[PDB]
Symmetry: C2
Subunit: 146 residues, 2 copies
């Protein structure tokens, strides 16, 4: 695997979400100026944001993480077993992950999204997923201006 | 390309939808016992069903096509330039397609979906897209029991 450390965690997170009836995308943009490492979508439309921190420095750089809260029902960190997990915010959910799997060790508290916002984000997720899929199946089949 | 004839049309349809800000999936299941060749999703949540008929016999077999109507805002046929297009229902939309591109030659009439149904179908589309994407990016990363 030539995946970067964050991509590795996200692979394991995605495997684990899928094993439990969720689906996911990577590098999702809920609003201008924000990007989340993994967005998970539950079978009833539950929205999870998972930030994959591959190092303490990676975590130090996500200082405005509380800004992700308004864009999800549940917010989680995902780190590997070498990460000092006790330093993460107590109120957050937590997964321990690697490139091959993940486990939730602390379930995030539920801060449900309003109906209109849930709609916008599901539409964005759909769009993200379907674009990336089409591009993998048909690499030449789009233009530079979209 | 080792794509079957219907898959070829669907490739061209998908390219063309994407060029105009739509996204798509293939072999979409809106309800038990139905499957549509291409589902298109518009940037405002418009739902299009496109049936890709590669032969007159293919069209003859889609006799219950009026059953697709309740699952979309707009219903289209997609055929190649060798197809006797005049034989298709007058009320339907029409694309002429091949493996490389497509064009709408007749815009389908709008029969808008109810809000609750639009939601269900967008959720299904999201789920379909994201599963297939994850499986292409990580072939081994799921189990046989989902
Ligand atoms: Na992705
Ligand atoms: Na990261
Ligand atoms: Na597909
Ligand atoms: Na077909």
């Amino acid at each position: 695997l030539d995946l970067q450390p964050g991509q590795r965690l996200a692979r394991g997170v995605a495997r684990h979400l899928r094993a439990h009836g969720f689906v996911s995308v990577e590098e999702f943009v809920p609003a201008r100026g924000l990007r989340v490492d993994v967005m998970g979508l539950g079978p009833k439309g539950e929205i999870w944001v998972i930030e994959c921190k591959s190092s303490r420095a990676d975590f130090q750089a996500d200082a405005k993480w509380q800004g992700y809260l308004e864009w999800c029902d549940r917010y989680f960190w995902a780190v590997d077993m070498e990460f000092p997990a006790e330093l993460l915010p107590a109120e957050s959910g937590l997964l321990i992950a690697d490139a091959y799997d993940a486990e939730i060790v602390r379930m995030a508290p539920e801060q449900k999204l309003a109906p209109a916002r849930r709609k916008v984000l599901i539409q964005k997720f759909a769009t993200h997923a379907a674009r990336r899929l089409q591009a993998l199946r048909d690499p030449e089949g789009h233009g530079i201006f979209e």
